[PDB]
Amino acid sequence: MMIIDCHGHYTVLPKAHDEWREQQKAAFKAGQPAPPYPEISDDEIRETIEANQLRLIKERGADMTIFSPRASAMAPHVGDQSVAVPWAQACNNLIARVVDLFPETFAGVCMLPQSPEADMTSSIAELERCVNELGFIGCNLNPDPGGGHFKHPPLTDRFWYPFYEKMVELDVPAMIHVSGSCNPAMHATGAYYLAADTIAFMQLLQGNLFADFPTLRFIIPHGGGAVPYHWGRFRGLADMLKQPSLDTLLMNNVFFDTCVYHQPGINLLADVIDNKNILFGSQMVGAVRGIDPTTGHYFDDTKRYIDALDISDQERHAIFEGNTRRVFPRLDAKLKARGLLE
Amino acid sequence: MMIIDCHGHYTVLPKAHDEWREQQKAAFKAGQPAPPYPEISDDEIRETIEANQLRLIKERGADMTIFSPRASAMAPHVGDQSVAVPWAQACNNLIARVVDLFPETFAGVCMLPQSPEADMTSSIAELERCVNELGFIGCNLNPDPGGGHFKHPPLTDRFWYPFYEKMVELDVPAMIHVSGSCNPAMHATGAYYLAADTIAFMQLLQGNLFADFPTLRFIIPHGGGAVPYHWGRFRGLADMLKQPSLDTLLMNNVFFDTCVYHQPGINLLADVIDNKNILFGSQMVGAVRGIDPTTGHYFDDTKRYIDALDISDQERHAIFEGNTRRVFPRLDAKLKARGLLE
Numbered sequence: 250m251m252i253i254d255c256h257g258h259y260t261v262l263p264k265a266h267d268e269w270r271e272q273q274k275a276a277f278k279a280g281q282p283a284p285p286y287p288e289i290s291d292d293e294i295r296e297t298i299e300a301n302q303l304r305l306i307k308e309r310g311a312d313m314t315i316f317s318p319r320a321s322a323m324a325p326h327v328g329d330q331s332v333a334v335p336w337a338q339a340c341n342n343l344i345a346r347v348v349d350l351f352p353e354t355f356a357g358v359c360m361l362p363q364s365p366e367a368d369m370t371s372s373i374a375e376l377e378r379c380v381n382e383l384g385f386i387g388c389n390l391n392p393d394p395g396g397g398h399f400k401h402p403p404l405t406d407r408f409w410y411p412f413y414e415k416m417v418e419l420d421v422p423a424m425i426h427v428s429g430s431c432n433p434a435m436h437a438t439g440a441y442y443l444a445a446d447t448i449a450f451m452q453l454l455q456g457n458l459f460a461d462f463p464t465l466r467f468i469i470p471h472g473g474g475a476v477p478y479h480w481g482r483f484r485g486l487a488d489m490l491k492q493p494s495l496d497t498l499l500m501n502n503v504f505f506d507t508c509v510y511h512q513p514g515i516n517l518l519a520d521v522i523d524n525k526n527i528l529f530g531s532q533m534v535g536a537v538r539g540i541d542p543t544t545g546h547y548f549d550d551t552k553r554y555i556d557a558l559d560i561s562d563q564e565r566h567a568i569f570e571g572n573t574r575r576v577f578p579r580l581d582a583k584l585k586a587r588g589l590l591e
Numbered sequence: 592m593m594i595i596d597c598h599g600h601y602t603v604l605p606k607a608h609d610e611w612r613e614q615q616k617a618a619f620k621a622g623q624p625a626p627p628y629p630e631i632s633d634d635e636i637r638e639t640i641e642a643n644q645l646r647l648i649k650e651r652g653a654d655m656t657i658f659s660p661r662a663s664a665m666a667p668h669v670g671d672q673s674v675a676v677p678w679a680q681a682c683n684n685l686i687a688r689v690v691d692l693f694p695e696t697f698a699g700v701c702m703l704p705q706s707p708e709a710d711m712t713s714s715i716a717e718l719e720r721c722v723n724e725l726g727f728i729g730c731n732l733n734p735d736p737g738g739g740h741f742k743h744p745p746l747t748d749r750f751w752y753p754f755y756e757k758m759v760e761l762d763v764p765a766m767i768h769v770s771g772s773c774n775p776a777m778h779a780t781g782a783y784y785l786a787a788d789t790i791a792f793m794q795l796l797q798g799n800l801f802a803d804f805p806t807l808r809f810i811i812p813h814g815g816g817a818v819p820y821h822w823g824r825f826r827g828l829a830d831m832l833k834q835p836s837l838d839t840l841l842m843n844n845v846f847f848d849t850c851v852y853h854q855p856g857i858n859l860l861a862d863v864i865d866n867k868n869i870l871f872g873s874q875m876v877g878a879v880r881g882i883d884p885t886t887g888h889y890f891d892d893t894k895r896y897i898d899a900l901d902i903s904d905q906e907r908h909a910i911f912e913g914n915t916r917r918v919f920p921r922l923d924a925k926l927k928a929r930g931l932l933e
């Protein structure tokens with residue numbers, strides 16, 4: 250069995266990328282056109298990947314990561330589409346370069362040129378660019394470009410439907426993912442991420458999207474936010490609302506990663522969420538890069554937790570490889586084509 | 592041993608209470624005066640209590656509930672002061688009455704008259720009355736009076752120092768608690784609630800409030816939100832921020848109730864939170880009022896989950912009686928004068 254980390258971002262980047270974004274943001278304020286993008290060097294990228302992800306991958310024993318842009322640096326709220334298209338384009342192009350340099354190790358997933366004041370029309374074009382052109386396999390979907398006030402329609406809205414249709418056309422899932430927090434009242438990677446996970450879940454709970462899009466597949470990170478910890482709570486509200494059971498309404502279409510940075514959380518996730526819904530990931534080099542004083546191992550080396558479970562090979566296969574190949578059909582294919590058959 | 596339920600609102604009310612509130616908002620739109628507040632009978636109060644909470648207190652083996660006005664219905668987001676005050680008293684006076692009519696069973700916690708536009712001015716005044724006049728033992732403190740977009744100072748700000756000083760003086764904890772959400776893309780009791788618990792806790796980990804107010808005690812309900820589920824992540828972020836450990840910084844002053852509506856969630860909280868920091872709670876007759884198809888029993892019969900934990904009798908004593916009598920010294924006091932020692 251492979252070991253496929255379904256959640257991981259290019260977080261430790263070359264100097265000149267983070268340059269142009271800041272100056273890019275800068276010519277928007279000064280009502281200026283932006284300057285040319287720096288032409289990065291192949292081996293500048295190689296360094297960052299070899300020094301970071303590729304090093305931990307090797308030490309932790311993984312096979313590939315599904316790899317998208319730094320999510321905290323997405324920042325759709327800055328500014329309008331003018332800043333956010335060339336900016337998403339720059340970030341995905343880099344994800345594309347990293348796949349080309351290390352295509353045995355990384356599979357492409359794109360962020361969207363979403364902006365508060367716009368619809369999904371450009372995001373559709375970027376997704377078709379990145380799937381049909383650059384060979385990506387899914388996308389990251391920001392349910393709140395405003396940056397920390399959840400001022401957007403639920404995912405059950407028809408605001409998003411034009412986008413779900415193309416997701417269905419291309420056969421790619423979305424990872425529901427928020428970005429940086431310009432809500433001064435909200436820590437991004439401690440509060441904001443975990444809140445948007447639950448809200449999105451509770452949103453779908455309130456509707457029935459997947460009656461409309463039966464093959465639409467979402468991933469909700471961080472082990473679904475606060476959802477498994479409160480699994481019984483969400484089951485009783487399905488009744489309170491007069492809704493179908495969770496297993497029927499959502500859990501053919503919603504999936505949870507394993508970025509829960511301690512054994513008891515991973516224990517609870519496996520106890521309460523069906524094996525088919527659980528995708529391995531750890532987003533290494535992210536929100537918690539330190540050792541855990543209590544376990545002598547890194548907080549984000551989650552594979553250590555899944556290997557601590559008492560689960561079968563059949564279950565263990567599903568978590569590390571199976572679910573993710575079924576959730577990402579385009580990656581399954583590419584792997585079958587290499588003779589890597591499940 | 593004594594079984595005290597630290598989280599409970601008055602959800603099934605005399606009908607005039609509700610008919611009136613709709614008129615006070617009906618008036619307030621029509622720039623109209625409020626209608627006279629309906630005179631309500633002790634029995635119309637007895638009936639709803641006797642028929643609802645007391646019937647379940649009996650069946651469930653609980654000795655007394657810390658009792659405050661209904662959460663979904665505080666609604667500081669409607670609209671200004673001249674609403675929030677009279678509404679705040681009308682509700683808190685109801686609790687005071689319930690405590691009289693049932694003073695071996697209900698101890699009083701008050702809802703403050705917070706409004707989006709207002710500082711902790713009236714709220715400070717509603718705390719003196721309710722603890723000195725009416726004899727309450729603690730308060731509920733809304734971190735997002737705006738009611739849906741977290742547009743308020745963090746619990747670390749000096750804006751709340753005045754009222755924090757009132758709590759310290761009188762000697763009363765605060766349950767952090769948000770109310771009804773006016774935000775479609777977000778559902779009050781299944782999302783807003785959980786997100787507010789997790790934000791407040793992280794707002795605190797980012798700061799050092801208890802350095803200023805070393806006796807200030809909060810209670811974060813729903814089992815701390817996503818926090819114990821993600822506890823390793825929060826311990827990690829403490830190092831990421833160069834912050835003291837969480838017990839040092841927080842867990843002498845911060846506590847969690849046991850409002851986790853299924854066995855596995857209760858299993859975890861007790862695994863990772865210090866027994867000293869866990870307070871038995873249920874919020875019966877609130878968010879999830881039905882039975883659980885998988886157990887036969889109610890989702891919200893939380894005592895059953897504390898019962899099924901393998902934990903010592905001391906440890907059991909703290910959750911049902913010890914910790915909350917230490918967290919509400921005015922309760923601690925009243926019980927000892929009834930002869931009820933620990």
Ligand SMILES: O=C(O)C/C(=C/C(=O)C(=O)O)C(=O)O
Binds near residue numbers: 318319534
């Ligand atoms: O940007 C960073 O370094 C932090 C970060 C965190 C996450 O995505 C996550 O915890 O799931 C990211 O955006 O990649």
Ligand SMILES: O=C(O)C/C(=C/C(=O)C(=O)O)C(=O)O
Binds near residue numbers: 600664
């Ligand atoms: O009002 C209602 O019916 C819902 C309700 C919910 C809560 O407080 C909770 O989940 O903790 C209440 O206000 O008691």
Ligand SMILES: [Zn+2]
Binds near residue numbers: 256258320426470532
């Ligand atoms: Zn992420």
Ligand SMILES: [Zn+2]
Binds near residue numbers: 598662
């Ligand atoms: Zn409550």
